[PDB]
Design an enzyme around this catalytic site. Structure first.
Site, PDB file in Angstrom:
ATOM      1  N   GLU B 158     -74.850 149.943  27.766  1.00  0.00           N
ATOM      2  CA  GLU B 158     -74.497 151.207  28.394  1.00  0.00           C
ATOM      3  C   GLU B 158     -75.504 152.302  28.070  1.00  0.00           C
ATOM      4  O   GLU B 158     -75.915 153.049  28.959  1.00  0.00           O
ATOM      5  CB  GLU B 158     -73.071 151.636  28.024  1.00  0.00           C
ATOM      6  CG  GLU B 158     -71.996 150.612  28.397  1.00  0.00           C
ATOM      7  CD  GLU B 158     -71.958 150.297  29.887  1.00  0.00           C
ATOM      8  OE1 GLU B 158     -72.363 151.158  30.696  1.00  0.00           O
ATOM      9  OE2 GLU B 158     -71.534 149.178  30.253  1.00  0.00           O
ATOM     10  N   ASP B 345     -91.396 132.149  34.692  1.00  0.00           N
ATOM     11  CA  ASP B 345     -91.234 131.188  33.607  1.00  0.00           C
ATOM     12  C   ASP B 345     -90.169 131.603  32.606  1.00  0.00           C
ATOM     13  O   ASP B 345     -89.444 130.757  32.087  1.00  0.00           O
ATOM     14  CB  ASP B 345     -92.558 130.999  32.848  1.00  0.00           C
ATOM     15  CG  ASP B 345     -93.573 130.165  33.615  1.00  0.00           C
ATOM     16  OD1 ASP B 345     -93.164 129.210  34.301  1.00  0.00           O
ATOM     17  OD2 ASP B 345     -94.784 130.468  33.523  1.00  0.00           O
ATOM     18  N   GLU B 348     -84.338 133.841  34.493  1.00  0.00           N
ATOM     19  CA  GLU B 348     -83.577 133.422  35.659  1.00  0.00           C
ATOM     20  C   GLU B 348     -82.476 134.459  35.896  1.00  0.00           C
ATOM     21  O   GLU B 348     -81.644 134.696  35.007  1.00  0.00           O
ATOM     22  CB  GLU B 348     -82.963 132.033  35.423  1.00  0.00           C
ATOM     23  CG  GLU B 348     -82.328 131.417  36.657  1.00  0.00           C
ATOM     24  CD  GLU B 348     -83.369 131.121  37.733  1.00  0.00           C
ATOM     25  OE1 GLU B 348     -84.427 130.552  37.388  1.00  0.00           O
ATOM     26  OE2 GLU B 348     -83.138 131.455  38.913  1.00  0.00           O
ATOM     27  N   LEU B 402     -86.007 125.513  36.417  1.00  0.00           N
ATOM     28  CA  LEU B 402     -84.588 125.764  36.620  1.00  0.00           C
ATOM     29  C   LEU B 402     -84.321 126.370  37.989  1.00  0.00           C
ATOM     30  O   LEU B 402     -84.694 127.521  38.244  1.00  0.00           O
ATOM     31  CB  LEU B 402     -84.094 126.709  35.524  1.00  0.00           C
ATOM     32  CG  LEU B 402     -82.649 127.198  35.615  1.00  0.00           C
ATOM     33  CD1 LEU B 402     -81.689 126.031  35.400  1.00  0.00           C
ATOM     34  CD2 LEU B 402     -82.420 128.289  34.593  1.00  0.00           C
ATOM     35  N   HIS B 462     -92.400 121.323  36.263  1.00  0.00           N
ATOM     36  CA  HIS B 462     -91.324 122.134  36.839  1.00  0.00           C
ATOM     37  C   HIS B 462     -90.861 121.629  38.203  1.00  0.00           C
ATOM     38  O   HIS B 462     -91.687 121.231  39.032  1.00  0.00           O
ATOM     39  CB  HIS B 462     -91.781 123.593  36.978  1.00  0.00           C
ATOM     40  CG  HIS B 462     -92.187 124.222  35.682  1.00  0.00           C
ATOM     41  ND1 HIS B 462     -92.709 125.496  35.605  1.00  0.00           N
ATOM     42  CD2 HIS B 462     -92.142 123.752  34.411  1.00  0.00           C
ATOM     43  CE1 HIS B 462     -92.980 125.779  34.342  1.00  0.00           C
ATOM     44  NE2 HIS B 462     -92.658 124.733  33.600  1.00  0.00           N
ATOM     45  N   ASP B 464     -89.949 123.503  40.615  1.00  0.00           N
ATOM     46  CA  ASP B 464     -90.376 124.334  41.744  1.00  0.00           C
ATOM     47  C   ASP B 464     -91.834 124.102  42.162  1.00  0.00           C
ATOM     48  O   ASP B 464     -92.317 124.680  43.137  1.00  0.00           O
ATOM     49  CB  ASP B 464     -89.964 125.819  41.626  1.00  0.00           C
ATOM     50  CG  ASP B 464     -90.695 126.567  40.543  1.00  0.00           C
ATOM     51  OD1 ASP B 464     -91.691 126.040  39.997  1.00  0.00           O
ATOM     52  OD2 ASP B 464     -90.264 127.715  40.256  1.00  0.00           O
ATOM     53  N   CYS B 638     -99.906 134.384  39.311  1.00  0.00           N
ATOM     54  CA  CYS B 638     -98.918 135.444  39.453  1.00  0.00           C
ATOM     55  C   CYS B 638     -97.540 134.824  39.445  1.00  0.00           C
ATOM     56  O   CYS B 638     -97.399 133.601  39.516  1.00  0.00           O
ATOM     57  CB  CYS B 638     -99.138 136.237  40.743  1.00  0.00           C
ATOM     58  SG  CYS B 638    -100.825 136.821  40.952  1.00  0.00           S
TER      59      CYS B 638
HETATM   60 CA   LIG Z   1     -86.254 129.433  38.402  1.00  0.00          CA
HETATM   61 CA   LIG Z   2     -71.406 148.103  32.449  1.00  0.00          CA
HETATM   62 CA   LIG Z   3     -71.032 147.206  28.868  1.00  0.00          CA
END
Ligand SMILES: [Ca+2]
Ligand SMILES: [Ca+2]
Ligand SMILES: [Ca+2]
Ligand SMILES: [Ca+2]
Ligand SMILES: [Ca+2]
Ligand SMILES: [Ca+2]
Ligand SMILES: [Ca+2]
Ligand SMILES: [Ca+2]
Ligand SMILES: [Ca+2]
Ligand SMILES: [Ca+2]
Lengths: 659, 659
Positions: B158, B345, B348, B402, B462, B464, B638
């Site tokens: 927060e 890398d 996710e 992944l 990987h 992908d 990239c």
């Molecule tokens: Ca991924």
């Molecule tokens: Ca929140």
């Molecule tokens: Ca929170």
């Protein structure tokens, strides 16, 4: 044919492949076409089915057609075989490529196939025989309609020369061991040998390697031997292929019961592997999987038929031995005696079952006790134990603290094997509780869905001090028996009013005589009354849990008079022997002799208990284990454990709730 | 009234008890009878319902009757109350005892009751508001008809002044935090105070104490404060009772995602406790329980609407930045740039959802990387990570390894959130595999039912690198895109035959010029052909797994030309950039610029890819991230990660299979 597999034709070359029955191939002919090729045709042998698939639409093609199709990436072949190759097989598909000028092929690409059947089979439908390729063999489901194969922990011991359970090693000695094991058959069909570059391999995960062991039986010249092919420190086994229609028989043992972190489900795999080149891992062309669930350890309620009565006492406790013998003679049970409370405290007779086999197995209580009960380990008598790592053992780890209810229905949910019962303390109390290692094990068996009661108000702390179950003769019903102090106070007050206040307690126990305990002396002891009012509150708290968790009403309960004295920890010990902890052999009940106040030369406690039970057809025999000691200080001097027949309801037919 | 509770009358005395609404009492009047008493009668107040139960048969009795019944142990009372006691209440039952001679009572025993409502309430029916006493609040079931309360891991932050996620401490600072939390209300009704000897206590287990935290909001003079009443090192909280009809509002945070050894289910209890005496534990007279399931971490397939495109590159890669910007401008997405492959890398983007709230949350890849991605942690942007203890990190732990499929139906079973995809090596290979800690975490989320593919034939390793998914515009369908070497060889052979063999590769990359790579030079390299035939076998093995585990046919798949070169470990690295790993923003595809052979001054790879995708309504933009480096050695320079809207299908409406 179910699973689609990708096999591409190779540009200008010939591709040779094993075709495993139950699959089929999708075949790219476009990538292998010479540049400039326009159309293609194909030939195929008798046992190879070929379809031309254009954009999803398929057409069957003749063995020798002259038909030509436009070469397109979206025009492919679908190749199917229904039967294994023999030595007389030539199984092939040949594709010819044409350019736009001329009808003579400019090139050719071909597919040479060897079809084999490979199936790893187990008895998934649970009839005791191994069916051919059960489509459900790769999962495990509960219930009457449920399916998937069952495995026993092989925890018994076939031969006495070894001190340990059969599953503790990687070796098999006697062929009798195999009877405890589940059969697994690798079934194959094919030509005399696999094509060059292939092998068949059985394997398991590292994780499952301490959960199973797998043996193969060889019959060489000098006699039968047992080869351990998968298990501890063996994760894979290269199979020796034999041609024609063949079957290899394997035997599987479980090494471990379900537990915290182990569901009981294990996997075994077979793969056809293809050699690529050196330094490159072999490729799993095809894989078949079977699943086993390891059978749970299951306890036996007092409603089940008694088989053997195990008894321990000192050699000179004669009345006990005579009275127990007489009791057992009324039944068909066998008596076994060891020359003393251990047999009750240190062991619980359970059982395991699979469709092919089952045997009794002993749970051995955690050591504080420097040594195991392991001398009961024998042929078809199994053994299991759990010991704490960190946590310290207390009296609540004794198996007087471990019981099981008869089958019950609760809120519409049936518990066909009953529910395990264990005594504990209130959650905020800081009191005693059975060790986590044992609790986790009992919970992990799942089929008895354990319930914790409150035993920690008792000095010893066991559920069998305050409660038990008995059948109602000639019916399918049962009663919960509860110790009750208020029942005892009511009876004694009645006897006092009748003029019996001077009736003496513990008659015939000479070491109690100088105490001169009478009804009057009991009823006038104020602090004792208060102690027992409190103990009745403890009993009633348990009563409510049992009614709730066992689906019981007041109609299912009978109260037996009991009395306790408080120690310095504010816990209860028996004032006179607890009658609720009794030997139940169907209609016959061995009841601890209470030594209560004599009125007209009969124990008023005995007469009161008979009046409660006998109208039901329960036959009462009072058994005296204490006279040999001349007094009673609250400790029981003998132990008994009854080994019973298993439930006729199969555990795998149960459907327990999600976890 | 549902649960029966045991409250016994006490001999000659008066018993005072709290009666909790939703229960009822069974009352023994027999034990309290003086000896010699024959019959009993009873009086009761207006708000107490009393039944006389003889052997199971019940009869309602008037407030003042003179009716008498025979004293028997099987004749008891059933006592019921439907409303809470006020200060104007006298709630009581009085029993009079008579002997056989005379109609004046010889004694009296009585029961004084204070009725209270106690209910711990949560939003079990999952509409975002807390209903009164949902009978299903103590269990958790899946599906549209499913029920039970949901809890978010409060993993966002927060306020920026603290470096760590909100859940890492026992404190709450801003009221905005409460919006992430599930509401729990303790609802009560009763008189001005509890009777002497009682208290109400909230509690949790030691085990759950690192899974939750519970706060109470106080509004003292100097402003709102947040009291942590249950959580790490607080297992119980004594509640301050206020009379009349009252509600105490609590806020619950999850501290932990489901994981190996943690199902995601937690419990919170309230008990009414009764004081017995010093040194004796308090007795739990009544207990109410609510269950929470902690919401799983869920990934987003490429079919979902893009929200933000995160991009990382060096500050001078201009064509990349210009082309990505143009791409994003075609859409409503926002561009975010960091000044280089990490964002792909190391992270996710997932999300969490509860009926009341949801926010995106980042999974941070395991460190080998000496530092976390934690600078994305912010308000409603959450963070989670898993690090290995023993196991060493490899390239397969990178989140290029992944991915997640779109929603699929497989063998009749729907996966509404799709299925997580992770690259691995064959089981007997001894090859690389993603670390167990991450694998266990993904599996534990359960709703994406992860599948392992074979990535370990690639140097980087990987998924992908070889596969991706794209929507089919104007439909609800999607396509699997697969890298294909055979597609590349077919195209190049066609171009060679067309007279294009001298067409040069990597035009405009000056560091590649002295190599002079042409179609001819590629096609005549024999070992390279063999390397790529092998790589196509690896791709096809994956193709078969995907069709099997995603329920896909050849109609759902498109092949993109690709080419690899083998290293000394026999693993593949890209010969030219992998076009399959692309930015998918609905109909718009950012595709890595291949730098293929120029024919009529257009890349033949670009033209071939357009011809495949464009007829579907997919708009292709080729993006050049490599020209700034003047060459291509197989490494991508990239990274991009697209953050997407969550599925509209609620995870709790799924029904995953048993575990
Ligand atoms: Ca991924
Ligand atoms: Ca929140
Ligand atoms: Ca929170
Ligand atoms: Ca069978
Ligand atoms: Ca053995
Ligand atoms: Ca054996
Ligand atoms: Ca045996
Ligand atoms: Ca026992
Ligand atoms: Ca609600
Ligand atoms: Ca916090």
């Amino acid at each position: 044919m179910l699973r689609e597999r990708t096999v591409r034709l190779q540009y200008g070359s010939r591709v040779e492949a094993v075709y495993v029955l139950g699959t089929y191939l999708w075949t790219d002919v476009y990538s292998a076409a010479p540049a400039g090729a326009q159309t293609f045709s194909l030939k195929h042998s008798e046992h190879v089915w070929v379809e031309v698939v254009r954009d999803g639409e398929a057409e069957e093609v003749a063995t020798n057609g002259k038909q030509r199709w436009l070469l397109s990436p979206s025009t492919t072949l679908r190749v199917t075989m229904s039967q294994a190759s023999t030595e007389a097989s030539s199984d092939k598909v040949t594709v010819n490529y044409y350019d736009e000028e001329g009808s003579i092929p400019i090139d050719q690409a071909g597919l040479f196939l060897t079809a084999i059947e490979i199936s790893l089979d187990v008895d998934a439908d649970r009839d005791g025989v191994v069916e051919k390729n059960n489509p459900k063999k790769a999962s495990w489901t509960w219930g009457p309609e449920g399916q998937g194969a069952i495995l026993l922990v092989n925890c018994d011991r076939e031969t006495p020369w070894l001190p340990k359970e059969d599953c503790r090693d990687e070796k098999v000695y006697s062929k009798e061991d195999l009877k405890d094991m589940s059969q697994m058959i690798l079934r194959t069909k094919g030509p005399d040998r696999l094509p060059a570059g292939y092998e068949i391999v059985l394997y398991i995960s590292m994780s499952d390697s301490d959960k199973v062991g797998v043996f193969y039986v060889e019959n060489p010249f000098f006699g039968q031997r047992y080869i351990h092919i998968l298990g501890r420190r063996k994760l894979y086994h290269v199979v020796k292929y034999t041609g024609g229609s063949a079957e290899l028989l394997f035997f599987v043992e479980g090494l471990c019961f379900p537990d915290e972190g182990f569901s009981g489900l294990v996997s075994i795999h077979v793969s056809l592997l293809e050699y690529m080149a050196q330094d490159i891992p072999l490729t799993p062309i095809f894989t078949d999987t079977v699943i086993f669930r390891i059978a749970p350890w299951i306890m036996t309620p007092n409603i089940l038929p008694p088989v053997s009565v195990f008894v321990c006492c000192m050699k000179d406790n004669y009345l006990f031995l005579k009275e127990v013998k007489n009791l057992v003679e009324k039944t068909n049970c066998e008596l076994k005696v060891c020359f003393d409370r251990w047999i009750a405290d240190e062991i619980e007779f359970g059982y395991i079952e699979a469709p092919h086999k089952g045997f009794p197995v002993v749970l051995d209580s955690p050591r504080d006790k420097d040594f195991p009960v392991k001398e009961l380990l024998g042929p078809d008598f199994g053994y299991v134990t759990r010991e704490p790592l960190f946590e310290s053992v207390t009296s609540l780890d004794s198996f007087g603290n471990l019981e099981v209810s008869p089958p019950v229905t609760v809120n519409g949910k049936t518990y066909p094997l009953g529910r395990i019962l264990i005594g504990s303390s209130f959650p905020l109390s800081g009191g005693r509780r059975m060790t986590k290692v044992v609790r986790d094990f009992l919970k992990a068996q799942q089929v008895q869905a354990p319930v914790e009661l409150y035993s920690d108000w008792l000095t010893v702390g066991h559920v069998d001090e305050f409660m038990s179950f008995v059948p109602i003769p000639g019916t399918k019903k049962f009663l919960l028996l509860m110790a009750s102090t208020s029942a005892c106070y009511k009876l004694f007050r009645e006897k006092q009013k009748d003029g019996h206040g001077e009736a003496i307690m513990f008659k015939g126990l000479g070491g109690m005589s100088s105490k001169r305990i009478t009804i009057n002396k009991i009823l006038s002891n104020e602090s004792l009354v208060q102690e027992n009012l409190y103990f009745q509150r403890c009993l009633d708290w348990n009563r409510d849990i049992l009614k709730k968790e066992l689906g019981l009403t007041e109609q299912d309960i009978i109260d037996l008079p009991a009395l306790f004295k408080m120690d310095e920890d504010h816990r209860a010990r028996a004032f006179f022997p607890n009658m609720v902890n009794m030997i139940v052999l169907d209609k016959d009940l061995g009841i601890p002799k209470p030594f209560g106040p004599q009125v007209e030369e009969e124990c008023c406690l005995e007469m009161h208990v008979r009046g409660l039970l006998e109208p039901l057809g329960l036959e009462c025999t009072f058994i005296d284990d204490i006279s040999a000691y001349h007094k009673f200080l609250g400790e029981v001097h003998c132990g008994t454990n009854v080994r019973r027949k298993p439930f006729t309801f199969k555990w795998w037919h149960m459907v327990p709730s999600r976890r």
